[PDB]
Design an enzyme around this catalytic site. Structure first.
Site, PDB file in Angstrom:
ATOM      1  N   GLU A 191     -18.227  -3.302  30.488  1.00 38.57           N
ATOM      2  CA  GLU A 191     -19.575  -3.104  30.630  1.00 38.57           C
ATOM      3  C   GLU A 191     -19.888  -3.905  29.913  1.00 38.57           C
ATOM      4  O   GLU A 191     -21.300  -4.710  30.026  1.00 38.57           O
ATOM      5  CB  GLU A 191     -20.098  -2.284  29.065  1.00 38.57           C
ATOM      6  CG  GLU A 191     -19.542  -0.284  29.951  1.00 38.57           C
ATOM      7  CD  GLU A 191     -20.105   0.436  28.939  1.00 38.57           C
ATOM      8  OE1 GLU A 191     -21.107   1.054  28.867  1.00 38.57           O
ATOM      9  OE2 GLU A 191     -18.811   0.927  28.212  1.00 38.57           O
ATOM     10  N   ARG A 246     -15.983  10.773  29.678  1.00 38.73           N
ATOM     11  CA  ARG A 246     -16.194  11.613  28.736  1.00 38.73           C
ATOM     12  C   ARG A 246     -14.558  12.862  28.496  1.00 38.73           C
ATOM     13  O   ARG A 246     -14.728  14.356  28.247  1.00 38.73           O
ATOM     14  CB  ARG A 246     -16.395  12.715  30.280  1.00 38.73           C
ATOM     15  CG  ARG A 246     -18.579  12.456  30.546  1.00 38.73           C
ATOM     16  CD  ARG A 246     -18.558  13.065  31.443  1.00 38.73           C
ATOM     17  NE  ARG A 246     -17.652  11.979  32.759  1.00 38.73           N
ATOM     18  CZ  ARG A 246     -18.374  13.383  33.793  1.00 38.73           C
ATOM     19  NH1 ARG A 246     -17.958  14.490  34.297  1.00 38.73           N
ATOM     20  NH2 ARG A 246     -18.001  12.611  35.167  1.00 38.73           N
TER      21      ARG A 246
HETATM   22  C1  HEM Z   1     -16.837   6.855  23.926  1.00 40.41           C
HETATM   23  C2  HEM Z   1     -16.657   5.966  24.756  1.00 40.41           C
HETATM   24  C3  HEM Z   1     -17.902   5.945  26.077  1.00 40.41           C
HETATM   25  C4  HEM Z   1     -16.970   5.133  26.792  1.00 40.41           C
HETATM   26  C5  HEM Z   1     -16.229   4.609  27.048  1.00 40.41           C
HETATM   27  C6  HEM Z   1     -18.365   5.094  27.842  1.00 40.41           C
HETATM   28  C7  HEM Z   1     -18.132   4.774  29.363  1.00 40.41           C
HETATM   29  C8  HEM Z   1     -19.655   4.721  30.176  1.00 40.41           C
HETATM   30  C9  HEM Z   1     -19.626   3.990  31.304  1.00 40.41           C
HETATM   31  C10 HEM Z   1     -18.414   2.410  31.477  1.00 40.41           C
HETATM   32  C11 HEM Z   1     -21.057   4.088  31.743  1.00 40.41           C
HETATM   33  C12 HEM Z   1     -21.107   3.236  33.007  1.00 40.41           C
HETATM   34  C13 HEM Z   1     -22.594   3.274  32.884  1.00 40.41           C
HETATM   35  C14 HEM Z   1     -22.596   1.880  33.036  1.00 40.41           C
HETATM   36  O1  HEM Z   1     -21.815   1.018  33.789  1.00 40.41           O
HETATM   37  O2  HEM Z   1     -24.198   0.920  32.547  1.00 40.41           O
HETATM   38  C15 HEM Z   1     -21.066   5.053  31.396  1.00 40.41           C
HETATM   39  C16 HEM Z   1     -22.235   6.190  31.149  1.00 40.41           C
HETATM   40  C17 HEM Z   1     -22.489   7.113  31.338  1.00 40.41           C
HETATM   41  N1  HEM Z   1     -22.448   7.747  29.556  1.00 40.41           N
HETATM   42 FE1  HEM Z   1     -20.511   7.397  28.906  1.00 40.41          FE
HETATM   43  N2  HEM Z   1     -19.402   6.150  28.187  1.00 40.41           N
HETATM   44  C18 HEM Z   1     -19.160   7.074  26.791  1.00 40.41           C
HETATM   45  C19 HEM Z   1     -19.555   7.353  25.674  1.00 40.41           C
HETATM   46  C20 HEM Z   1     -20.848   8.633  25.631  1.00 40.41           C
HETATM   47  C21 HEM Z   1     -21.061   9.017  25.133  1.00 40.41           C
HETATM   48  C22 HEM Z   1     -20.467  10.075  23.715  1.00 40.41           C
HETATM   49  C23 HEM Z   1     -22.224   9.833  25.521  1.00 40.41           C
HETATM   50  C24 HEM Z   1     -23.417  10.606  25.176  1.00 40.41           C
HETATM   51  C25 HEM Z   1     -23.059  11.836  24.357  1.00 40.41           C
HETATM   52  C26 HEM Z   1     -22.493   9.735  26.908  1.00 40.41           C
HETATM   53  C27 HEM Z   1     -23.123   9.777  27.957  1.00 40.41           C
HETATM   54  C28 HEM Z   1     -23.078   8.715  29.266  1.00 40.41           C
HETATM   55  C29 HEM Z   1     -24.283   8.855  30.174  1.00 40.41           C
HETATM   56  C30 HEM Z   1     -25.025  10.226  30.437  1.00 40.41           C
HETATM   57  C31 HEM Z   1     -24.319   7.989  31.468  1.00 40.41           C
HETATM   58  C32 HEM Z   1     -25.030   8.140  32.602  1.00 40.41           C
HETATM   59  C33 HEM Z   1     -25.859   7.493  32.355  1.00 40.41           C
HETATM   60  C34 HEM Z   1     -27.273   7.358  33.999  1.00 40.41           C
HETATM   61  O3  HEM Z   1     -27.107   8.426  34.501  1.00 40.41           O
HETATM   62  O4  HEM Z   1     -27.294   6.416  33.996  1.00 40.41           O
HETATM   63  N3  HEM Z   1     -21.229   8.550  27.187  1.00 40.41           N
HETATM   64  N4  HEM Z   1     -20.033   5.244  30.497  1.00 40.41           N
HETATM   65  C1  LIG Z   2     -25.397  -1.340  33.768  1.00 39.96           C
HETATM   66  N1  LIG Z   2     -26.410  -0.291  34.583  1.00 39.96           N
HETATM   67  C2  LIG Z   2     -27.112   0.250  33.567  1.00 39.96           C
HETATM   68  C3  LIG Z   2     -29.054  -1.540  33.412  1.00 39.96           C
HETATM   69  C4  LIG Z   2     -27.796   1.296  34.603  1.00 39.96           C
HETATM   70  C5  LIG Z   2     -28.816   2.377  33.107  1.00 39.96           C
HETATM   71  C6  LIG Z   2     -29.557   2.942  33.467  1.00 39.96           C
HETATM   72  C7  LIG Z   2     -29.492   3.804  31.722  1.00 39.96           C
HETATM   73  C8  LIG Z   2     -31.228   4.111  31.700  1.00 39.96           C
HETATM   74  N2  LIG Z   2     -32.356   4.697  31.192  1.00 39.96           N
HETATM   75  C9  LIG Z   2     -28.486   3.781  31.052  1.00 39.96           C
HETATM   76  C10 LIG Z   2     -27.822   3.494  31.113  1.00 39.96           C
HETATM   77  O1  LIG Z   2     -26.583   3.754  30.198  1.00 39.96           O
HETATM   78  C11 LIG Z   2     -25.465   4.062  31.121  1.00 39.96           C
HETATM   79  C12 LIG Z   2     -24.335   4.518  29.579  1.00 39.96           C
HETATM   80  C13 LIG Z   2     -24.849   5.308  28.569  1.00 39.96           C
HETATM   81  C14 LIG Z   2     -23.992   5.243  27.725  1.00 39.96           C
HETATM   82  C15 LIG Z   2     -22.985   4.721  27.197  1.00 39.96           C
HETATM   83  C16 LIG Z   2     -22.460   5.224  25.870  1.00 39.96           C
HETATM   84  C17 LIG Z   2     -22.951   6.199  25.053  1.00 39.96           C
HETATM   85  C18 LIG Z   2     -21.271   4.385  26.063  1.00 39.96           C
HETATM   86  C19 LIG Z   2     -20.773   3.354  26.564  1.00 39.96           C
HETATM   87  N3  LIG Z   2     -19.924   2.863  26.720  1.00 39.96           N
HETATM   88  N4  LIG Z   2     -21.349   2.894  27.372  1.00 39.96           N
HETATM   89  C20 LIG Z   2     -22.754   3.967  28.214  1.00 39.96           C
HETATM   90  C21 LIG Z   2     -22.821   3.467  29.647  1.00 39.96           C
HETATM   91  C22 LIG Z   2     -27.364   2.826  32.291  1.00 39.96           C
END
Ligand code: HEM
Ligand SMILES: CN[C@@H](C)Cc1cc(C#N)cc(OCc2ccc3c(C)cc(N)nc3c2)c1
Ligand code: HEM
Ligand SMILES: CN[C@@H](C)Cc1cc(C#N)cc(OCc2ccc3c(C)cc(N)nc3c2)c1
Ligand SMILES: C[C@H](O)[C@H](O)[C@H]1CNc2nc(N)[nH]c(=O)c2N1
Ligand SMILES: C[C@H](O)[C@H](O)[C@H]1CNc2nc(N)[nH]c(=O)c2N1
Ligand SMILES: [Zn+2]
Lengths: 411, 410
Positions: free
Chosen positions: B286, B112
């Protein structure tokens, strides 16, 4: 009301009813989660309900609930409280309490073993010298020449809070830490403050990198006293690596017995302020935290150099690489010397089995995910994908302030 | 009531007041913490007004025009429109602000620190799956930017009566297929096995390979969804090789450069955007820790450690840990070598600590979900491990929503 948790790797779902038996608060609310906060003189007024609740649990567990022995014991405790303002646990009750305090330790990944805990009753102890003796015997019995056995020694309960028994050490066995004039630290940075207290109390420090600290023991509210654990009672393990011959030359060693001594045991409203307990190590406790934490021995740098890693970019993952090797070397060393240790894979697997077993035969298992998941390789251990419910049950182990911050110095 | 968070590695203490503006609920109670739980009819005119006011109040404060003519005017404007039309539409400015702040408020997101440099594509004039496909291709190409990845979100029309939902059925825009074998196990990507089946069941001709990019399944205005094939030249992929081990190429591994999550719901001022795919760039773990080495995923750990001839007879040899590290070294190496944006878990967590500081400093706090912020490997040697965090739900926000195939009336 029933609550479910899901393991997302196996789709196994478990139903918790035990959480209903919870009274104490978590620190969380409907609007805020304090799941990652480290830490979010009792009168006769509030004591008997605590007592009753415990005795109710106790007699339930031995299938004597409602029995004459149960009711008589309630009455006996009652009268003893209004008469003496406190009360004494029977040996049976003490042992049950200590085991269940561990069983309820939601942050502890080792709880599969909770029922094989060896309980040493030291409630007859009156002096620091007396305490030293109980602790020496604990260490000797627990250590068992490397074949570690879980144990707890329980000193007398709190009375008016002006006569506490305290072990001032955070663990029975820990290495000294010395802040040098040039800003650097010799030994274990985690122990610099306690080390200074010892030295002020008259301890003669060897000032080496692995000096075992003395025991600083407090009996009945008196000033605490220094004692040296007999070195033949302190089992240690030289740390070497199975492939890297240069690792021995790092000069590292660790002690074999993890024995936490600054917590408080609470049983039926009684407070046991000195209750050192011990089990055995999970490798990561030493190899990840005790060695590689930035605020600890922090040998990551040195190991990375000797491995000739690219320490220029972090994205070379040299840190990750060195961390693994160090933890390999810690497990290798302990097993080589036949000293009990468990790896984080074995331990988390065990826990999942323990947890499932606890959900079925008990209706739940309180667990703290933040603490249960190992500090390396989390997602490749089965607890990572395991949803957990965290609540607080009694008997329990609780944090308590460092005695040197509250203690009234006699002189 | 004014809460503190401490970093136990650096003793830095931050005071959180932002939590007091929290509206939604965490799922916890005073007796039970649900912090490790994955997930713990339309809005009436009644519930919609206050959600709008709250959102507009924070919008006009953010532009230092709280209590202005414009504020009261726009407030009355939306007030009027809701009473008439039973809903309302956001100004472009408010839409961009909303989307940016749904990201800013995503307590589980470690990335973020980039939140305010989001590119918002308004797609509220879209009416068909074909149109959706067009917008999505444009999103993909813009976000990819020849490997110089750029954050973006594309926002399709807001829910009306729940009968006319725009939905992207893919969990992510770009994901590989997963095929169940008669042999018993699973070929391709196991996470995507049910969706792969749905695509086939909807007409997709599966090449039944290992890295088959899934088609898009797009649903516009609540109609039956439609298959579309993303032009392969818009799908940037990275072949995975190891800077030390030559045999690593022979594993036949690649991954795509663009992580673009497409199944979440965006809520702004009470309004519900059920189709809002958003993308940024990968943190290395990831792909390497989760997408390769999870038991419920590619699970190549065994074959990798085999190729390294590690002692795989006891867990205490830590052959899994050793492999896991090498794989993540290779993922990072490959992306960096092909000039595709990627960030390592040390870099990202350090940025997030910096981001946290900024948010406490200029906003009074930052909602943060330790369980998800700490990376899936090497937790304690990253600065967030020792960072206490407060978790609470702020709005605008991204939310989970039902899979469409459990819902859709055909
Ligand atoms: C730009 C670089 C970004 C990185 C490095 C990043 C990284 C991550 C990581 C590592 C997670 C953990 C989820 C997982 O392990 O599956 C996550 C969750 C999440 N990201 Fe970021 N993200 C990025 C950009 C964004 C953007 C652009 C958005 C939306 C505008 C966003 C929204 C979210 C949301 C909503 C979650 C939580 C999803 C849930 O509750 O399951 N991300 N992100
Ligand atoms: C590995 N755990 C996942 C299986 C759980 C998960 C569920 C959902 C949903 N719906 C959405 C999820 O998204 C997380 C997320 C969302 C956005 C991302 C962006 C925009 C970039 C990034 N590098 N990782 C993200 C990771 C994850
Ligand atoms: C026998 C093998 C045991 C193992 C492998 C084990 C393992 C662990 C580990 C890894 C932690 C995490 C703490 C940290 O990372 O600093 C922990 C916490 C804890 N352990 Fe166990 N333990 C064992 C035995 C015991 C025993 C015998 C007791 C008491 C009777 C106990 C009580 C606790 C408590 C109370 C905590 C939480 C402390 C806190 O909240 O800070 N453990 N354990
Ligand atoms: C590194 N994190 C620590 C600074 C947090 C911590 C605080 C306290 C206290 N008081 C007590 C703690 O003990 C955890 C613990 C307790 C008992 C253990 C036993 C008996 C065995 C073992 N292998 N690990 C333990 C680990 C930890
Ligand atoms: C800030 C955070 O809550 C704190 O560092 C906790 C996190 N999880 C932990 N987990 C274990 N096993 N041991 C610890 O000391 C900690 N520390
Ligand atoms: C059981 C647990 O709640 C679940 O597996 C969570 C834990 N932490 C996570 N953290 C991240 N970054 N991504 C995840 O998918 C998960 N999964
Ligand atoms: Zn909570």
């Amino acid at each position: 009301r029933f609550l479910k948790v899901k393991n997302w790797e196996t789709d196994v779902v478990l139903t918790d009813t035990l959480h209903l038996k919870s009274t104490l608060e978590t620190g969380c609310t409907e609007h805020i989660c304090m799941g990652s906060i480290m830490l979010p003189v009792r009168t006769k007024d509030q004591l008997f309900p605590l007592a009753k609740e415990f005795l109710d649990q106790y007699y339930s567990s031995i299938k004597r609930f409602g029995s004459k022995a149960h009711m008589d014991r309630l009455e006996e405790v009652n009268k003893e409280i209004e008469s003496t303002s406190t009360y004494q646990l029977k040996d049976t009750e003490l042992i049950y309490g200590a085991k269940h305090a561990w069983r309820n330790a939601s942050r502890c990944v080792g709880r599969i073993q909770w029922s094989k805990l060896q309980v040493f009753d030291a409630r007859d102890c009156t002096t620091a010298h007396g305490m030293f003796n109980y602790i020496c015997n604990h260490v000797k019995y627990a250590t068992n020449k490397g074949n570690l056995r879980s144990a707890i020694t329980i000193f007398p309960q709190r009375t008016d809070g002006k006569h506490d028994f305290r072990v001032w050490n955070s663990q029975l066995i820990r290495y000294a830490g010395y802040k040098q004039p040039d800003g650097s630290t010799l030994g274990d940075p985690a122990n610099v403050q306690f080390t200074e207290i010892c030295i002020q109390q008259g301890w003669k420090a060897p000032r080496g990198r692995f000096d075992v600290l003395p025991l600083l023991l407090q009996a009945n509210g008196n000033d605490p006293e220094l004692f040296q654990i007999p070195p033949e009672l302190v089992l240690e393990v030289p740390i070497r690596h199975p492939k890297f011959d240069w690792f021995k030359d790092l000069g590292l060693k660790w002690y074999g017995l993890p024995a936490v001594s600054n917590m408080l045991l609470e049983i039926g409203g009684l407070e046991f302020s000195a209750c050192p307990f011990s089990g055995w190590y999970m490798g990561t406790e030493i190899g990840v935290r005790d060695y590689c934490d930035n605020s600890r021995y922090n040998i990551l740098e040195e190991v990375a150099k000797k491995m000739d890693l690219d320490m220029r970019k972090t994205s070379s993952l040299w840190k990750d690489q060195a961390l693994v090797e160090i933890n390999i070397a810690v497990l290798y060393s302990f097993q080589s010397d036949k000293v009990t240790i468990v790896d984080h894979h074995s331990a988390t697997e065990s826990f999942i089995k323990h947890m499932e077993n606890e959900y079925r035969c008990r209706g739940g298992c309180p667990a703290d995910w933040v603490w249960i998941v190992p500090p390396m390789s989390g997602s490749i251990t089965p607890v990572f994908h395991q949803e957990m419910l965290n609540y607080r049950l009694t008997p329990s182990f609780e944090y308590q302030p460092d005695p040197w911050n509250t203690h009234v110095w006699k002189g």
